[PDB]
Swiss-Prot record, chain A:
Portion of the parent chain present: 295 to 668 of 671
Organism from which the protein derives: Schizosaccharomyces pombe (strain 972 / ATCC 24843) (Fission yeast)
EC number: 2.3.2.26
Domain HECT: start-end pairs: 47-377
Name of protein: E3 ubiquitin-protein ligase pub2
GO biological process: cytoplasm to vacuole targeting by the NVT pathway; protein ubiquitination; ubiquitin-dependent protein catabolic process
Impact after mutating residue 336 to A: Reduces ubiquitin transfer between ubc4 and pub2
Subunit details: Interacts with the E2 ubiquitin-conjugating enzyme ubc4.
Reaction catalysed by this enzyme: S-ubiquitinyl-[E2 ubiquitin-conjugating enzyme]-L-cysteine + [acceptor protein]-L-lysine = [E2 ubiquitin-conjugating enzyme]-L-cysteine + N(6)-ubiquitinyl-[acceptor protein]-L-lysine
Entry GO terms, CC: cell cortex of cell tip; cell division site; cytoplasm; cytosol; membrane; nucleus
Function: E3 ubiquitin-protein ligase which accepts ubiquitin from an E2 ubiquitin-conjugating enzyme in the form of a thioester and then directly transfers the ubiquitin to targeted substrates.
Swiss-Prot record, chain B:
Chain's gene name: uep1
Covalent crosslink: Glycyl lysine isopeptide (Lys-Gly) (interchain with G-Cter in ubiquitin): 6, 11, 27, 29, 33, 48, 63
Compartment(s): Cytoplasm; Nucleus
Record lineage: Eukaryota, Fungi, Dikarya, Ascomycota, Taphrinomycotina
Designated name of the protein: Ubiquitin
The organism of origin for this protein: Schizosaccharomyces pombe (strain 972 / ATCC 24843) (Fission yeast)
Residues of the full protein shown: 1 to 75 of 128
Source organism superkingdom: Eukaryota
Protein purpose: Exists either covalently attached to another protein, or free (unanchored). When covalently bound, it is conjugated to target proteins via an isopeptide bond either as a monomer (monoubiquitin), a polymer linked via different Lys residues of the ubiquitin (polyubiquitin chains) or a linear polymer linked via the initiator Met of the ubiquitin (linear polyubiquitin chains).
Span of domain Ubiquitin-like: 1-75
Curated annotation (Swiss-Prot), chain C:
Protein name: Ubiquitin-conjugating enzyme E2 4
Effect after changing residue 105 to A: Reduces ubiquitin transfer between ubc4 and pub2. No effect on ubiquitin transfer between ptr3 and ubc4
Catalytic site: 85 (glycyl thioester intermediate)
Subunit structure: Interacts with the E1 ubiquitin-activating enzyme ptr3 and E3 ubiquitin-protein ligase pub2.
Xref: SUPFAM superfamilies: UBC-like (SSF54495)
GO cellular component: cytoplasm; cytosol; nucleus
Gene Ontology MF terms in the entry: ATP binding; ubiquitin conjugating enzyme activity; ubiquitin-protein transferase activity
Consequence recorded when altering residue 97 to D: Reduces ubiquitin transfer between ubc4 and pub2. Enhances ubiquitin transfer between ptr3 and ubc4
Species for this entry: Schizosaccharomyces pombe (strain 972 / ATCC 24843) (Fission yeast)
UniProt similarity note: Belongs to the ubiquitin-conjugating enzyme family.
Effect of substituting residue 90 to A: Reduces ubiquitin transfer between ubc4 and pub2. Reduces ubiquitin transfer between ptr3 and ubc4
């Protein structure tokens, strides 16, 4: 069982003498509105010895009990603030497939090292004090944190179409019709600049005897070399608290579970931020659908979400800020088709066509059968 | 007879079939020679899409007919 | 890699064009192209002219361009904003494809609308039920807008 082994690893990690908290209590006060500013003001000055004491968090002007819930809410707010793409630190890998990664443009700031060291300290504090964030990075990020070699398949998690094109180049031969050469054009604030994968790379065309080296260099540049200094600062900040000899007993999935807990898809937000065409909230096929989604395991809900929208990952703010192929396109339920046909899905418009069935058993059977070929989580 | 197919990447495929041969048989031969499933194959001849259940002669296909492989419609 | 390829595409279009569809950079910006499509003569859109805006992503040719219509067309697979996600430009893209293949695919789509991707359910229903009414409406729209 994967869960039992992961629990054994977690217990062994938290039983180490170098990851034991002290008894003195550190009170960390932050205002609810200005969470990011005050968090960066306080955390970026704490000593490592101070950060190892018990973390007590009290929001300003909000006296209350159950400090555990308060600390969890604080970490949720901070994780949704610092990792928000609008803050120009991280960014989605693609608009239609929401995966956080370090933004290459973040170097525009005069000193990104301080901010990324703060991010590393926040992640180390979350792992150290048994508190969960709620962000969802890409697998190459975790493979970088553990210092694992990165190969071509790792581009599949970042961008699907890019990986398909790279695999096409690997499989089929390359002619001189494709004007490909050892250089990458990057648009940084309007102006486009050329980066040479190898010295004098813009004057070397990729023949059939170079495409393997070209793919290797492209993968390395896309996944690693574009974010060297920033990730070095982030990992230094993270390893400040958690020694690297401790993180290197997990893998790219157990570390994700440790950072974010058991991944789940909220149903209340899904219901509150959906829209219907030719359907109404009082229609039977909608109340039955939401009851079924209520009494379902997270794996099957993720499978349905991937079947309908196209990906199993959600934006950082739930279904509210959901993007389609062309732009913002919230989850849509439509009455299209005959009774006998299975429910269908238009992925590029986040649409689910559900015919007017006659009973909840029939809807459950059709909806479970129609998503079998999909894989979620 | 022999027919020619132009694929997406410019590859030219020669197929030894007959006008009386059904569309299913021609698609089976194409799949055997290339591996592309017949359902995903969208061959346009004279600006029209061929359909299964018929023969080549049903679409006025003659010797050395030229077909263009195009992409399926999703919009 | 994203500029030599575009220059090659423009040069190829300038030598042996489709002679019906045309493409060209808008002003001086190689990553934003205008395209013109002549309505097929064997379809109700005959005699019309259509304009497309093509945006080339920096990852070209690995990532497909984004094409958007400018003139409204009564089509089961073209919405009011005029966006076509067809698999050549979202899922079935390979580096070997050029920008002329995309225009040829679109000019072929303007004759065989997809019935099983009802991007406009009203228009798709009209197409599946009343073919004559559908074609009359398409010609009405083409006369109304594409001029």
């Amino acid at each position: 069982s994967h869960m039992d082994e992961y629990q054994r690893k977690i217990a062994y990690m938290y039983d180490r003498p170098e990851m034991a908290v002290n008894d003195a209590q550190l009170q960390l006060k932050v205002s609810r509105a200005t969470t990011f500013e005050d968090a960066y003001d306080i955390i970026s000055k704490l000593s490592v010895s101070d950060m190892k004491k018990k973390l007590l968090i009290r929001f300003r002007n909000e006296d209350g009990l159950d400090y555990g819930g308060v600390s969890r809410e604080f970490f949720y707010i901070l994780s949704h603030a610092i990792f928000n793409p609008g803050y120009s630190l991280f960014e989605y890998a693609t608009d239609d497939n929401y995966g956080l990664q370090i933004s290459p443009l973040s170097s525009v700031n005069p000193d990104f090292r301080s901010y990324f060291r703060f991010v590393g300290r926040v992640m180390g504090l979350a792992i150290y004090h048994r508190r969960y964030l709620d962000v969802q990075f890409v697998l190459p990020f975790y493979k970088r944190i553990l210092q694992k070699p990165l190969c071509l398949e790792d581009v599949k998690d970042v961008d699907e179409v890019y990986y398909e094109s790279l695999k096409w180049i690997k499989n089929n031969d390359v002619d001189e019709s494709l004007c490909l050469n050892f250089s990458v054009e990057e648009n940084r604030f309007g102006e486009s600049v050329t980066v040479d994968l190898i010295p004098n790379g813009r004057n070397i065309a990729v023949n059939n005897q170079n495409k393997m080296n070209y793919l290797k260099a492209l993968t390395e540049h896309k996944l690693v070399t574009s974010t060297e200094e920033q990730f070095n600062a982030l990992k230094g900040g993270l390893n400040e608290l958690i020694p690297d000899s401790v993180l290197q007993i997990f893998n790219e999935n157990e570390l994700d579970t440790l950072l974010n807990g058991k991944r789940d898809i909220d149903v209340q937000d899904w219901k509150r931020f959906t829209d219907y065409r030719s359907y109404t909230e009082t229609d039977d096929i909608v109340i039955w659908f939401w009851e079924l989604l209520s009494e379902w395991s997270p794996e099957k809900k993720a499978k349905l979400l991937q079947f309908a929208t196209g990906t199993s990952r959600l934006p950082l703010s739930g279904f509210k800020d959901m993007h389609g192929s062309d732009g913002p396109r919230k989850f849509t339920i439509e009455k299209v088709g005959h009774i006998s046909q299975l429910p269908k899905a238009h992925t590029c418009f986040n649409r689910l066509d559900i015919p007017p069935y006659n009973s909840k058993e029939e809807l459950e059977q059709k909806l479970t059968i129609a998503i079998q070929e999909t894989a979620g989580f | 007879m022999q027919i020619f197919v132009k694929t997406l990447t410019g590859k030219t495929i020669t197929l030894e079939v007959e006008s009386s041969d059904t569309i299913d048989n021609v698609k089976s031969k194409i799949q055997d020679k290339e591996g592309i499933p017949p359902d995903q194959q969208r061959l346009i001849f004279a600006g029209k899409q061929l359909e299964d259940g018929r023969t080549l002669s049903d679409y006025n296909i003659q010797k050395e007919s030229t077909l263009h492989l195009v992409l399926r419609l999703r919009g | 890699m994203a500029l030599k390829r575009i220059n090659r595409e423009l040069a190829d279009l300038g030598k042996d064009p489709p002679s019906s569809s045309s493409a060209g950079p808008v002003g001086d910006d190689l990553f934003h192209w205008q395209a013109t499509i002549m309505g097929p003569a064997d379809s109700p859109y005959a005699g019309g002219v259509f304009f497309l805006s093509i945006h080339f992503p920096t990852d070209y040719p690995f990532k497909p361009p984004k094409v958007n219509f400018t003139t409204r067309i009564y089509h089961p697979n073209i919405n009011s904003n005029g966006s076509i996600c067809l698999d050549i430009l979202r899922d079935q893209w390979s580096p070997a494809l050029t920008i002329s293949k995309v225009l040829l695919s679109i000019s072929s789509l303007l004759t065989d609308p997809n019935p099983d991707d009802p991007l406009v359910p009203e228009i798709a229903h009209v197409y599946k039920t009343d073919r004559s009414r559908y074609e009359l409406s398409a010609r009405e729209w083409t006369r109304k807008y594409a001029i």
